[PDB]
Amino acid sequence: TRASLRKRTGRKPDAVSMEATIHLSKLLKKKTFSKRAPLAIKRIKAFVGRLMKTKDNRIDASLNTYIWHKGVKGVPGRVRVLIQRKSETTEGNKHKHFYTVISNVPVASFKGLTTKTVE
Amino acid sequence: MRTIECEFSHFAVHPGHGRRYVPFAFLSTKPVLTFSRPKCFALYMRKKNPRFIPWTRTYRRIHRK
Amino acid sequence: SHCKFEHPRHGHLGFLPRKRSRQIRGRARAFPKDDATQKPHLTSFMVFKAGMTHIVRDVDRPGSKVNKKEVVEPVTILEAPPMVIVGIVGYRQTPVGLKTIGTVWAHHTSVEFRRRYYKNWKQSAQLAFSRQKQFANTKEGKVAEARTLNAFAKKASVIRVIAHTQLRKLRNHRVGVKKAHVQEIQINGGNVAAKIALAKSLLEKEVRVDSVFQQSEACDVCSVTKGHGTEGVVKRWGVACLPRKTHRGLRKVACIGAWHPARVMYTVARAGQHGYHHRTQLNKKIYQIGRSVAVEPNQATTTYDLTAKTITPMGGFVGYGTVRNDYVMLKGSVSGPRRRVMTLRRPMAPQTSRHLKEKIVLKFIDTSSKIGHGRFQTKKEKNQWFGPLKKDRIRREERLRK
RNA sequence: AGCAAAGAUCUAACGGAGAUAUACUCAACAUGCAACGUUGGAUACUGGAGCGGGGAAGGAUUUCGUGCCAACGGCACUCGU
RNA sequence: UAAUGAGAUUCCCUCUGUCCCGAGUUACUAUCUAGCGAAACGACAGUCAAGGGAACGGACUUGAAGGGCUAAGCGGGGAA
RNA sequence: CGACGUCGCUUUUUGAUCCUUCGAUGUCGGCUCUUCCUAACCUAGCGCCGCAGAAGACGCUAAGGGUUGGAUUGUUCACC
RNA sequence: AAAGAUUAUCCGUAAGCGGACGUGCGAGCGGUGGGUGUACGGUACGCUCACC
RNA sequence: GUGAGAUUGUGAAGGGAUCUCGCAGGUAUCGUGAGGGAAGUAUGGGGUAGUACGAGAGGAACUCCCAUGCCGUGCCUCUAGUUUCUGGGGUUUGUCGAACGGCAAGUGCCCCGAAGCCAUCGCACGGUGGUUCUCGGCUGAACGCCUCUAAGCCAGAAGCCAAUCCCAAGACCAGAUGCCCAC
RNA sequence: UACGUCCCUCUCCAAACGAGAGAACAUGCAUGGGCUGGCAUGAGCGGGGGGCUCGUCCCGAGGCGCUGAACCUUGAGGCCUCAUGCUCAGGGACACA
Ligand SMILES: [Mg+2]
Ligand SMILES: [Mg+2]
Ligand SMILES: [Mg+2]
Ligand SMILES: [Mg+2]
Ligand SMILES: [Mg+2]
Ligand SMILES: [Mg+2]
C-alpha cells in the first residue's frame, strides 16, 4: 500500500523536539465564547499528547500568553508550536516518565509551514 | 434552455439557478430582471451602479481593460 | 363529547413502530412477481448516494400546458460499481413459509467479501472460506456442489444469487467501510432450469448496472432514511404547536387521551426516534445510466449541450467526493444521506401509465458548484471570467525563472 | 430530584502524605485519576449609588500570630470568620 | 364637563411569529461523569375486555394477554 | 305525506330519585389530540318517484375517507 | 426429513443403469509454490501439505 | 467418570468423607415471515357536446387525457429562512501612547455570508388481486303454468380480506451458511 | 486449546447515555499546496476641497496604483494524492471450572 512502502527507521530518541502548526479553528468551532481559551489549552495538550505519547504536557508561558492574548473568545486560528520531549522520573517508579514542554514559535504567516524536527 | 445574464453584475445565470424579478416601473425591453445572487439584488435595491463595484462585469470592462 | 371540529389525524399509522432500522442498508422485503414467460434477469442492484443536482429536458405530454416545453427537474446521482456474484441460494415452498435449500459458492471469493465475516480483519487469522475453498474441488465436494444444484432443480421455486458491492473499485475516501455489502438478488423469468443456468453463468463474474435496468424506466429504491435522533412530537408527527402563553411548554400534545379507556393509545403521537427508518418509495423514474470516467470523460454532455464535462460538479459532491464509476440518475429524491448504500429494485407497480412509459432525452445537466451558489459549469468558464490572477502571474514567474 | 442569578478562569515554578504510585519477558500513550495553598505571569471583573475606605444599631473576640484538619465552611481544601 | 388616570370599553393608523405555519441559532438546564445528597409519598401491590357488585375493579367470575431486567421521556389511569 | 288513535325505540335534554363519594373524584366553555358509534351531510354501488333532461324527494348496503375560514357573544346554543 | 430403518459407497429413475485409488512406496481429484501472454486495474484461468 | 471449589460459630499442621456445578458450545453473515400494524382520499378543467332528452326554456354522463385540494412518506439540486464558520468587510463608544494587531460592550451594531438544518415558502413519490352486501339477474321447482331461491349459478360497494408497505422467531426458525472447538 | 468477541485508541451515514455504521500501519491522522466557494480590494509604499512655511516644501478626509488584493475554506466532521510529516514486536479483558 502506501503505509507499507514507507522508509521506516527505528524509534526517534527519547529526547526529540519538533515544530508543528495546529489549526485551532477546526477544534474551536461553535464552542461557547467564555471557554474557548480554557479548552484550547486542552486541545493542544491532547494534540501533542497523542503525538508524543505523553500525559505530562507543559505549556511554558509563551504559549499560554499566545492563546490568551485576545481574551477568552479571540483564540487564534493557528499556532506554530515547539514541542520538546524530555525524561525525568521520581526515584522508585517501575516505569519511565516522559514529559512534553510545548512553547510558541512566532512566524507572522502560517502558509507553507509543515512539520519539521528541530535540534 | 439559455444562459441569461444578471442585471446588476452580468454573471452567468444557467437554468434553474437565479431569481427573476419584475418591478412596477417595468421596461418594455426588460420587463423581468434576472438576478444571480441576493447580493446582486441587494445592491440593486440600494440603487448602486454596476460600475464602482469591483466584482461586476461593468467595472472590469471599463477599468481593467 | 365529540371533537368540536375535524382535522385528519397526524402521521400515517402504518409506518409504526417508528424505531431505528435494524440494518443500515436497503433490503427488499418483496421482489417483483415472477413472470416465467420472460427471460431470466436480475431484479435489484446496490448503488451509493452521491449528492443530487438538476437537469433540463423537454416534455412530451400531449394535452399538457408544458407540452414540448423545457422543464427543470431535480435528479439524484447514485454511483454504481458492479456487483460480483458469489453464491446461488434456492428457496422451496412450505405451508410455514419459504425455506432455504442451500447455497453453492463461487470457488473464488474476494478479500472484501470475506471481510464481512470479521469485526477485525487485519488483526485476525483471515481463514474464512478456507476449508470450503479446498473441499469444493475434492472428489466428494464436487459431488456435493452438484448434489445441491440438483436439489434446486427439484424443490426450488425461487432462485436467488448473492452479490456484493465490490468496494475497492469504489475508490471513495468518505465511504469508510472496506467490507462488502451483501444481499440476495432474485432471478425472475423462465422456469427453474433456465434460472439456474443464468445463476451459474454469472457466478464469480461481476454484473454491471446497465444489464439490469434501462435508461428511461422506473424502479423502487429500498433505502434507510436519514437519522435525526430523539425528536419531539412537533418534528416527528407534525402536530400543531400550542399557544404562546402555555405553562410547561408549547411543543407537546395537549390531550393524550380520555379518562376511559384508561390507557394511552398507540395512535396518540409521542416523542422518540425520528429518522433512520427503512422506506421503499416506488416509481422513481430513471433518466441516465452513466458510464465510468475511464470510459467517458464527457458524461454530462448532451446532444443539445456540447460542453465537455463530467457528472461530478465543481469542487465535488459536497461531503462525498467524485463519481468514479458507473452511475444511475433518478428523478427526484431518495431516502437517505449521501454515502449510504441503496437498493434499486425493479417496479412492482404497473408501469403502464403514460407518465412512466415516457422516453427521456435530456438537454442540460447542472455541473456547477454545490458549494455556495453555482455559477460556472466548467473550470474552463471560470478561467474566462477571471483572467490571470495574482497567484497565476507568480506561478508564471516561477515557470519562466525555472 | 438536585447542588443552573451575581460573566472566568489559564499557566509555570514551589509547598504538601495527597505521586510521575504497574507481579514478569513492557520505551513512553493505551494501568494513580481528581483535587489544595503561595508567589510570578497572562486574562478578566467590580467601575467611585464599588465584591473601595470608615461609623451608628446589632454582634462581642469574629481581631492578630502560630500550630493544626477529627467534626463544620451542602463540591473541595494543605485554606478558614 | 377642559385638564388629569398602572381605571372600564370600542374603532382606526403604524406595527409586528398572536396567527396562517412553522423553521433555525444562542446562553443555561435537562442529559453523561467526579464530589455531595434530600423530600413528597408509601396498607399490600400494580396488563386488560365484559359480567356482577356500595349500581366506573389492580385483586372476584369467564375470557385475552404477559420471558426476565433496564435508560430517557411522558402526562391516560392509580376515582395520584 | 298522513290527522284521530296506537305500539315502541333513544339516554347528546330535563324532571324525578337519593344508591356511591362531605378525614375532597378540582364544578363551564374554548384550545389541543386520539378513538368510537350510525339514526349517512359529501364521496362508492344501488333500488324507486306525481324520475323527459337538468336539479331533486324517499329508501337500501355501507362509518373506509372527508366534514372549513370568519364577524358578534365567556358562551353550548343562536345568527348572518 | 432422509429412506436400509434390520446390514450400509455414490449418481440418476419404479423394471432398469452411470463409476468407485490400487497396495511404507505409488497414483487421482486438490488447497499453496516459479518464470513469458488472456477474459469483464488485481483476482482468476495455462503448463510443499492434506484427503480418497 | 473426569476438572474445579466449599464444609466459614472454640488453637495448629495433616488427609478422610460429603455436598454444590463445570464437562459443549462460541462467533459471524444471508434470509423465512406467523402474528401485529396499515392509507391514500377528494376535486376541477379538456372533449363527449350544446349531443342525448325536450314543444321550447334548458341541458347530461362513462372511456380517455391534463391538472389540483387535503393527507402521507421522504428530500435539500433550485428558490426562500436560519449564522457562534463571531467567515470577510463596514461602523459607534471606551481602551492598549499613535499607526499595526486587536480587545471590552453576557455575540456592540449593520451588510453580505458557506456548510448544516429546514418550508406546501421549494422538490420528488404515493400500486394490485379477490371475497360478498345491497341489488339486478340465470336456470328452476314447490304449486301440471308462474317465480332471482327453495337446491344450485352469474355479475358485483369507497365496505371486508389479502398483495404491496412497516415491525417482526416469547412464532423459540432440524432455514441456509463462514470459521473454530467439542464429539 | 483455538477461531474469535469486547474494552481502550481512530472515523462519522449513527447518537441524550447505551446501541449503530466503520476502520484498526490504513492518504488513517496531521499540516501544507491546489481546487471550490465566501467577502469585496489587506498592511505598506508612492504620485484632493483647502490650508501653512520660506517656484518649492509640509498639513489634509477622501481618491488612485501595485491588487478580483488580503483573509477564510471542514471543523458535528467541502473537494483533490497533489506533496511531505507522524506510527516502529498496538495495549488491557474475556473466550477458558
Ligand atoms: Mg447525522
Ligand atoms: Mg450544575
Ligand atoms: Mg468593566
Ligand atoms: Mg463540605
Ligand atoms: Mg394617581
Ligand atoms: Mg398481515
List all residues 6 or more positions away from C179 whose beta carbon is below 8 Å from its beta carbon.
C112, C115, C116, C118, C121, C167
As a whole number of angstroms, the distance between CA C81 and CA C206 comes to 9
Closest Cα partner for C284 from C332, C349, C352, C341? C332
| Inter-chain residue contact C366 with B16, CB threshold 8 Å | yes
Q: What pairs with residue C185 in β-bridges? A: C161
List all residues 6 or more positions away from A103 whose beta carbon is below 8 Å from its beta carbon.
A60, A62, A63, A81, A82, A84
List all residues 6 or more positions away from C119 whose beta carbon is below 8 Å from its beta carbon.
none
Asked whether the beta carbons of A40 and A22 are under 8 A apart, the reply is no
Residues in B closer than 8 angstroms to C375, CB to CB, are 11-12, 36
- Specify the 3-state DSSP secondary structure of C280: coil
Protein-covered nucleotides on strand D (Cβ within 7 A): 7-13, 19-24, 27-30, 33, 40-44
As a whole number of angstroms, the distance between CA C72 and CA C287 comes to 13
**Ligand number with the minimum distance to the CA of C227:** 1
Which cell goes with C21? 432500522
Resolution (A): 2.5
| Inter-chain residue contact B1 with C368, CB threshold 8 Å | no
Distances (CA, A) of C245 to C241, C248, C352: 12, 10, 54
In chain A, residues preceding a discontinuity (C to N beyond 2.5 A) are none
In eight-state DSSP terms, residue B46 is T
Residues in B closer than 8 angstroms to C381, CB to CB, are 12
As a whole number of angstroms, the distance between CA C165 and CA C177 comes to 11
As a whole number of angstroms, the distance between CA C122 and CA C82 comes to 25
The backbone torsions φ and ψ at residue A4, rounded to the nearest 5 degrees and listed phi first, read -90, -25
The backbone torsions φ and ψ at residue C214, rounded to the nearest 5 degrees and listed phi first, read -110, 175
Residues in B closer than 8 angstroms to C56, CB to CB, are 1, 15-16
Solved with: cryo-EM
Determine whether the distance from the CB of C262 to the nearest atom of strand F is below 7 Å: no
Residue C98 contacts B where some CB pair is shorter than 8 Å: no
As a whole number of angstroms, the distance between CA C71 and CA C81 comes to 30
3-state secondary structure A45-89: HCCCHHHHCCCEEECCCHHHHHHHECECCCCCCEEEEEEEEEECC
As a whole number of angstroms, the distance between CA B41 and CA B6 comes to 10
**Residue C10 CB coordination number (10 Å):** 16
Return the closest nucleotide (C1') to the Cα of C137. G30
Asked whether the beta carbons of C99 and C91 are under 8 A apart, the reply is yes
Are B and C close enough to touch, i.e. 3+ CB pairs under 8 angstroms? yes
- Specify the 3-state DSSP secondary structure of C197: helix
As a whole number of angstroms, the distance between CA A77 and CA A67 comes to 10
Angle at B16 between CA B10 and CA B19, to 5 degrees: 55
The identity of residue A23, as a single letter, is: H
CA C243 to C1' E19, in angstroms, rounded, equals 10
Sheet with A98-104, edge to edge strand ranges:
A56-58, A98-104, A78-87, A17-23, A116-117
The identity of residue C368, as a single letter, is: S
Asked whether the beta carbons of C153 and C146 are under 8 A apart, the reply is no
**Residue C45 CB coordination number (10 Å):** 27
**What do you get for the CA distance between the two ends of chain C, in Å?**
90
What chain C residue is nearest to B55 in terms of C-alpha separation?
Answer: C386
Which cell goes with C382? 471560470
Asked whether the beta carbons of C48 and C168 are under 8 A apart, the reply is no
Distance to chain B for C301, nearest Cα, Å: 14
Asked whether the beta carbons of C315 and C376 are under 8 A apart, the reply is no
C261: preceding bond cis by omega (within 30 degrees) = yes
